[PDB]
């Protein structure tokens, strides 16, 4: 099994509703930590991490994010000047993380930055050079390519620190991080007009669900796509057009790595 | 464990 530890940072312009800075941490598909510019502390979103991490962990994680908080705000002003934008609603985003592989394989890592939800700058870990598809990133790229300690440090995090803690998290959140199978329903709905296959309560989000008419695969099928529930699990509805009197047998087939064997359900 | 390597733009 592949596993990941990823962080998502969002800086928003001082404005309505949303805190000026919000960061979230994920092990695989499960959110486990949160920080925002109102509370100004890194807090658990999972019990396993709350139980297994002492005062020093939360103290340090809070301090780290406190450094990130002003940084991104400064960024929004810097990039507005660079793009000659002067006001309005603006965003900075940062994505970084690592992936651990047992099947194979070479470990991966990434750090990606975005300005107003468009590619700003990111690191090529293999070449150890920063890439930018825009002119307003070039001046940052030239500074960041020079900065050895920054570059090697970031690389050390993605390849070393990130992987190491991910491994600790996988041990400490072991049962909590296990896949949970979908509970699936296959029933006539909307006054017997449509036949709907609904899978709910599954984790992680990734899922295959296909409909079959009398051993044949059904195209022209309607799907909500995977969407979150309230408890860290996910759901999906796939439905097709129907007749209640018809002779042909209908089946719904589900693939989820919480199943470990293909699951079929008949009408 | 959050990344802590921060450098100005």
């Amino acid at each position: 099994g592949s596993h990941s530890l990823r962080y998502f940072f969002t800086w928003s312009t001082a404005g309505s509703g949303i805190p000026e800075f919000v960061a979230v941490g994920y092990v695989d598909d499960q959110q486990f930590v949160q920080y925002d510019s109102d509370r100004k502390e890194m807090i658990p979103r999972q019990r396993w991490v709350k139980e297994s991490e002492g005062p020093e962990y939360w103290e340090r994680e809070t301090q780290t994010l406190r450094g990130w908080e002003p940084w991104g705000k400064a960024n929004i002003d810097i990039l507005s000047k660079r793009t000659n934008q002067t006001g309005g609603i603006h965003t900075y985003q940062l994505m970084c993380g690592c992936e651990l592989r047992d099947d194979g394989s070479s470990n991966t890592g990434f750090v990606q930055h975005a300005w107003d939800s468009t590619d700003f700058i990111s690191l090529d870990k293999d070449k150890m050079v920063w890439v930018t598809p825009v002119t307003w990133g070039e001046i940052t790229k030239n500074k960041w390519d020079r900065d050895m300690a920054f570059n090697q440090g970031t690389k050390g995090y993605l390849e070393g620190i990130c992987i190491e803690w991910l491994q600790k998290y996988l041990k400490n959140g072991n049962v909590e991080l296990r896949p949970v199978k979908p509970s699936v329903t296959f029933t006539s709905v909307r006054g017997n007009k449509q036949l709907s296959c609904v899978a709910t309560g599954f984790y992680p989000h990734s899922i295959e669900v296909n409909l079959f008419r009398d051993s044949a695969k059904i195209d022209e099928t309607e799907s909500t796509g995977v969407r979150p529930n309230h408890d860290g699990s996910y759901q999906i509805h796939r439905s097709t057009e129907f007749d209640p009197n018809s002779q042909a047998k209908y089946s719904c087939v589900v693939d989820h790595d919480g199943l470990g064997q293909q699951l079929v359900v008949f009408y | 464990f959050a990344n802590f390597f921060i450098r100005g733009l």
Partner: protein, 96 residues
Amino acid sequence: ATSSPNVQVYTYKLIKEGESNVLLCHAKDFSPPNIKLELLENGRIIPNTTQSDLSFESDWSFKLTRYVEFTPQSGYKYSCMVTHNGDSKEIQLDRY
């Protein structure tokens, strides 16, 4: 770049009248994150809701979810009022 939200409103399990369920309103594929989600029961705001922490996909587009534990009654109509940027739209609960 700005994109308007794709909004879905749905329940955790199959609705049965008098069965305690969860009402969800999920917004995706939107930017900027200046957005508000308000769950409604007959056009009136449901109190005590929970909203997920702001997060985003690889394409930088944002995603948010607001939910309540609730009991669907026979007569009652449910929706979600979404305000993104200066635009406000209301999505009704699609029932089966």
